[PDB]
C-alpha cells in the first residue's frame, strides 16, 4: 500500500534511522516489494531483531519489531578439568559474547562445538546442555549443564614390522603408558595427540642410533570402544636392516680453521651410526664459530649410502656466514637498579668482535646474584646490516632484602628480640648492608655492616662492620653471665680468577666481663691465663680488648643464586690474633654445599652440605670459650635446639657449653611439588634431609675428673632426619621443618616443628 512516512515500534536498543536504512525503500511514493523481504533478511541477519511485523495504514508504514534479547551472564555447571576462559574463547570462535543477542537455535551447534572441544581433550562420552533464563530489559542469562562422562585408558600398542627385534616393552620409555603399575602410581593410561608425536620420533631416534638409516614408518592407526573406555592403537613400519658408516668429509668456507673441526669430527672408521652425536658435533662447531664471531652459517649433513655394504659416506657441507660484529647493547629490567652495575660483570664487551660465549658468561654472572626473579637475554640484527648486530639483556627484578628475627628460640639469645634487616642491592645500588638491633629492656646489642663489592673498579670489594653490645641477665644472679662488648671489622676483598676469590681484613674488640658463674670447666682457660678466683665465689669480673686479623677464601661456581640447581659454593674463613694483643690464637671455619640434578627436567636434584670449625692458639694462648663454636638450632641442625649440642655444664649441672671441634653434615633429596602451579611453584623449594653432627674438645679430658664422663671424642653422634619447606615471602625468606631425632646421647633436647627466618643456608 502507498506510504509517505515510516514509523517503527518496539525497538528500544537501536536507532530507527538505522532501522529504516536496513530496508532500502523509496518513501513518498509507493515503495518497493522488498520492504517485507528487507525487514526479514536484514533484521534477522543482524541477529539483533527477534521478530518483525510490518503494516501500512495508508499514509504511514508502522513497523512492529522486537529486539533479540541479549545475553547478560554466561555461566557454567559441570566444570571439572576445564576453564571458562577457554570456553569464552570457544564462544568468540562461535561469534558470541556477553552483550549479544541471538537465535537460541545455534545452541545445538554450540553444544556440538563444546563436544568437539571435549573430543579434543580426550572425552567423547560427554554431553552438554543449555539453560536459558529470560530477563527484562531485553536480556537473557545462560547457564551450561555438563555431564562429562569419562575418558578412556589405552589397551594395546602392537606394531607391524617390528620383527627380528622386540621393543614391545622398551616402548615403556614413552610419555604414553599401556601398563599402570599398582605400586608405581601417579598417572594412568590416557591418550594425547602430541605426546604421541614426540614419542614416535623419539623411538625413531632410538632406532636411528642402533645402526639404521631406513627404519621407516608405513602408517599410524588408532581406534577405541563404542563405550569409549579403552583405546586400541597400532602402527605399521619397516624395521629394515642394520647400517653402518664409512668415513666423513665436509665442504665450505672457513678461515683456515680446518685443524680444529678436524678434532671435533674425529672418529674411528667402521663405527655404529648415530644421529644425535652428529647434532651435538654441529652445535659444538657452532660454539666455535660463535667464538670466532659468527652467528648464522648453515650446516647440512647428507648420507651418501651404500646399502650394498650397509655403509655411508656422510657428505657434509657448511656455509660459514659472513663475519659479524656488534653495534649496540640494551638492557631491560632497570626499574630501581641502575645500569653499568651489571655491565661490570659482562665479560662480553661492546664495539668489537665477538663470542657467543662471553654472552653466556654474562648470563651466568647475572644469574649468580639472585637479584632477579627471572632473566632474559636476546639478540636481534640491526636493519641494513650484514655484519653489525645488536643485543638485549632483559630481566625481571626482585625484592630481595629481608627482616631477620631471632628470638633466642631454644635460648641462645634467651628471651629477647633480635631485629634487623639485610639488602644486597641497597637502593638499586650494588651497595650491600646488614643490621641488627637487639633489645630485652635491659640488654642491648646493635650492629651495622656494609660493603660495596665495587668500591673501585675491577670488582674491588670493601666492607666494614661495627657492633655495640651490653648483655644483662644477672639481675637475678642467673646463668649466662653479664658481658658488655663492642668492636669493629674492616675488610678488603677481591678475586683474581674469574670464579675464585680472596679477601682479608682486621678487627678490634673491647670486652668487659662480669658476674661470671662458678661454672667449672670454664676456669681452665683462665688458669691458662693465670687466675684462680672461686671456691664458689661471685665477685668475678674481667676486661680485655684485642685487635685481630682475618682472611677468607672462596670458590663459587653455580648456575645461580636464589634457589640454585647446580654446581657448588664454598667459603672458608681463617681468623687470627696478632702480636701485642691480650692473647694469641687462630681459627678456621668452612661452609660448603653443592647442587647436582638428574637433568634439571622434572627437577630431581640432590645437595650435599658440610661445614668444619676448628681453632687453637700458641704460647699457652688458647682461644676463648665465648668464641666457642656452638650447634643445634635447626639452621645447622634440624630437629634440635639453639646451641643445645654437646657437653654439659659443670659446677662444684647441664647446659650446652661450646667448644673447638666440630664436624656436621646433612644429606638431602630435593623435590618439586605437583599440587601447586608454576606461577609460584617456581618460587618455592622443598626437600628431605638426614642430619648428623658432633662436637668435642681435645684439651678436654676425664682421666682426672672421672666422676662424669669424657666429652673428648668425635664419636657420640647426634642424629636426626626430616623434611623442610623453604619459601619466599615479601618479608624475607621463610622456612619451616619437621624432623624426628633417633640418636641422642643423654641430657639433650629438641622440638619437631621449627621455624627459621632471614638468610637461609
Amino acid at each position: 500500500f502507498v506510504v509517505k512516512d515510516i514509523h517503527f515500534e518496539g525497538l528500544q536498543r537501536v536507532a530507527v534511522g538505522a532501522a529504516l536504512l536496513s530496508m532500502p525503500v523509496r518513501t513518498g511514493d509507493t515503495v518497493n516489494d522488498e520492504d517485507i523481504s528487507n525487514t526479514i533478511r536484514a533484521l534477522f541477519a543482524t541477529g539483533n531483531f527477534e521478530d518483525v511485523r510490518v503494516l501500512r495504514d495508508g499514509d504511514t508504514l508502522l513497523v512492529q519489531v522486537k529486539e533479540r534479547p541479549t545475553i547478560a551472564s554466561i555461566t557454567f555447571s559441570g566444570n571439572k578439568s576445564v576453564k571458562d576462559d577457554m570456553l569464552k574463547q570457544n564462544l568468540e570462535a562461535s561469534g558470541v559474547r556477553v552483550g549479544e543477542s541471538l537465535d537460541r537455535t545455534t545452541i545445538a551447534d554450540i553444544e556440538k562445538g563444546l563436544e568437539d572441544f571435549y573430543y579434543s581433550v580426550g572425552k567423547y562420552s560427554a554431553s552438554v546442555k543449555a539453560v536459558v533464563t529470560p530477563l527484562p530489559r531485553n536480556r537473557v542469562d545462560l547457564k551450561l549443564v555438563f555431564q562429562e562422562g569419562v575418558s578412556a585408558e589405552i589397551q594395546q600398542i602392537n606394531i607391524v614390522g617390528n620383527h627380528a627385534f622386540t621393543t614391545d616393552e622398551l616402548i615403556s620409555h614413552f610419555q604414553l603408558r599401556d601398563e599402570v603399575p599398582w605400586w608405581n602410581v601417579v598417572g594412568d593410561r590416557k591418550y594425547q595427540k602430541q605426546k604421541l608425536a614426540g614419542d614416535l620420533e623419539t623411538l625413531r631416534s632410538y632406532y636411528l642410533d642402533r645402526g639404521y638409516a631406513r627404519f621407516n614408518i608405513d602408517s599410524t592407526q588408532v581406534s577405541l570402544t563404542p563405550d569409549k573406555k579403552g583405546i586400541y592403537v597400532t602402527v605399521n613400519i619397516t624395521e629394515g636392516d642394520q647400517y653402518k658408516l664409512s668415513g666423513v668429509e665436509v665442504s665450505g668456507n672457513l678461515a683456515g680453521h680446518s685443524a680444529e673441526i678436524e678434532q671435533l669430527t674425529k672418529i674411528e672408521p667402521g663405527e655404529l651410526y648415530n644421529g644425535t652425536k652428529v647434532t651435538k658435533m654441529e652445535d659444538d662447531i657452532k660454539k666455535l664459530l660463535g667464538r670466532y664471531g659468527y652467528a648464522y652459517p648453515r650446516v647440512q649433513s647428507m648420507p651418501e649410502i651404500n646399502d650394498a655394504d650397509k655403509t655411508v659416506k656422510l657428505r657434509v657441507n657448511v656455509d660459514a656466514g659472513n663475519r659479524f660484529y656488534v653495534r649496540k647493547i640494551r638492557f631491560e629490567g632497570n626499574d630501581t637498579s641502575k645500569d653499568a652495575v651489571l655491565r661490570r660483570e659482562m665479560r662480553q664487551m661492546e664495539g668489537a668482535w665477538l663470542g657467543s660465549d662471553l654472552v653466556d658468561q654474562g648470563k651466568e654472572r647475572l644469574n649468580r646474584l639472585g637479584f632477579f626473579e627471572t632473566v632474559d637475554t636476546d639478540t636481534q640484527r640491526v636493519p641494513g646490516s650484514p655484519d653489525q648486530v645488536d643485543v638485549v639483556y632483559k630481566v625481571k627484578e626482585r625484592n630481595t632484602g629481608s627482616f631477620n628475627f631471632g628470638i633466642g628460640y631454644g635460648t641462645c639469645s634467651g628471651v629477647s628480640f633480635q631485629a634487623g634487616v639485610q639488602q644486597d642491592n641497597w637502593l638499586g645500588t650494588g651497595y650491600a648492608v646488614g643490621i641488627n638491633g637487639t633489645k630485652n629492656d635491659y640488654q642491648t646489642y646493635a650492629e651495622l655492616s656494609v660493603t660495596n663489592p665495587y668500591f673501585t673498579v675491577d670488582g674491588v670489594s670493601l666492607g666494614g662492620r661495627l657492633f655495640y653490645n651490653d648483655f644483662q641477665a644477672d639481675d637475678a644472679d642467673l646463668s649466662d653471665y653479664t658481658n658488655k662488648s663492642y668492636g669493629t671489622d674492616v675488610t678488603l676483598g677481591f678475586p683474581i680468577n674469574e670464579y675464585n676469590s680472596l679477601r682479608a681484613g682486621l678487627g678490634y674488640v673491647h670486652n668487659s666481663l662480669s658476674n661470671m658463674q662458678p661454672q667449672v670447666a670454664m676456669w681452665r682457660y683462665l688458669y691458662s691465663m693465670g687466675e684462680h678466683p672461686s671456691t664458689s665465689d661471685q665477685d668475678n669480673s674481667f676486661k680485655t680488648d684485642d685487635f685481630t686479623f682475618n682472611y677468607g677464601w672462596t670458590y663459587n661456581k653455580l648456575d645461580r643464586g636464589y634457589f640454585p640447581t647446580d654446581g657448588s659454593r664454598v667459603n672458608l674463613t681463617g681468623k687470627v690474633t696478632i702480636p701485642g694483643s691480650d692473647n694469641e690464637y687462630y681459627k678456621v671455619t668452612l661452609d660448603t654445599a653443592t647442587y647436582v640434578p638428574i637433568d634439571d627436567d622434572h627437577k630431581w636434584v640432590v645437595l650435599g652440605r658440610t661445614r668444619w670449625g676448628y681453632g687453637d692458639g700458641l704460647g699457652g694462648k688458647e682461644m676463648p670459650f665465648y668464641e666457642n663454636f656452638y650447634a643445634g638450632g635447626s639452621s645447622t641442625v634440624r630437629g634440635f635446639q639453639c646451641n643445645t649440642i654437646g657437653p654439659k655444664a659443670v659446677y662444684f649441672s647441664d647446659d650446652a657449653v661450646g667448644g673447638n671441634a666440630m664436624a656436621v653434615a646433612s644429606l638431602e633429596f630435593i623435590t618439586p611439588t605437583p599440587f601447586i602451579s608454576d606461577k609460584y611453584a617456581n618460587s618455592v623449594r622443598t626437600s628431605f634431609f638426614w642430619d648428623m653432627g658432633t662436637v668435642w674438645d681435645t684439651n678436654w679430658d676425664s682421666s682426672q675428673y672421672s666422676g662424669y664422663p669424657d666429652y673428648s671424642d668425635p664419636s657420640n653422634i647426634r642424629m636426626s632426619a626430616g623434611i623442610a619447606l623453604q619459601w619466599m615471602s615479601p618479608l624475607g625468606p621463610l622456612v619451616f621443618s619437621y624432623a624426628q631425632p633417633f640418636k641422642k646421647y643423654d641430657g639433650d633436647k629438641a622440638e619437631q616443628f621449627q621455624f627459621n627466618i632471614g638468610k637461609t643456608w
Partner: antibody
Amino acid sequence: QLVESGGGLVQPGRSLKLSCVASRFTFSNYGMNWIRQTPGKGLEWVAYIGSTSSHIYYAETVKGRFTISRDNAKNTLYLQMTGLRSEDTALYYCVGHVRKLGAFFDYWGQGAMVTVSS
Amino acid sequence: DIQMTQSPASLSASLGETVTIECRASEDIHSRLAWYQQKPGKSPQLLIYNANSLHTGVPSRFSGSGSGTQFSLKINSLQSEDVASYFCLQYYNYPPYTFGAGAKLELRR
C-alpha cells in the same frame, strides 16, 4: 733467676717495700704469691695476684693492709707492707705458679726473713 | 680455713722399705692436693700435682693414693738421701690455701 730485696730490721708499725725480680720466663701471666714460714713450722699463705694485677686476693691476717703490685717491663714484684707487728716476722717466699693447670706453684723464692724489733 | 690434717709426725726408716705418709682432709674432696718437699736449708720443691700425678724428672717410686677424705703418699723401695720435710696443700678452697703440718723425714741407722 729470681733476685729479691733484703729483710733487715724494722720497728712494729712501720712500712716496707720489698722487691722480687723475674728473669727468663714471660712473667706476663703466672699468678704470684708471698708465703711466709715461721721457724716454728707454721706455713702461711699471705698474698696472691693472678695473671696480671687484675685479681688480687689476700689472706685473713693482713685483711688488705698490705699491697702487692708488679711491673712487667721490669719483671718485678713490689710488696708494700703497712702496720707491722712482731708476729709478722717470718721467712717470706716469692712464689710462682704452674702453667696450664694452676692453683699451685712451680718456682719458689730464696725466702726473705723479716725482723721487727725495738 | 679448714682442717688441713697431716699425719703422723716425723718418721724414720731404713733404705729399701716402703713408706705411706698420710694427709687427711676434713671435707672429703678428691684430687684437691699437691705435695711439696722442703730440703733443709733448701728451697721447697714440687712432688705431686693432681694429688696423684708425679712431676717431670723424678723416679716412679713416688705414688699418690687415697680418697678425698684421706690420702697417702707411697714411696716404694726408697733409696738414698731424699730426707726433707714434706707437706700437702689443698686448692679446693681458693680464698684460703691450707698446707700440711709437714712431715720431717729422718732415717734409721
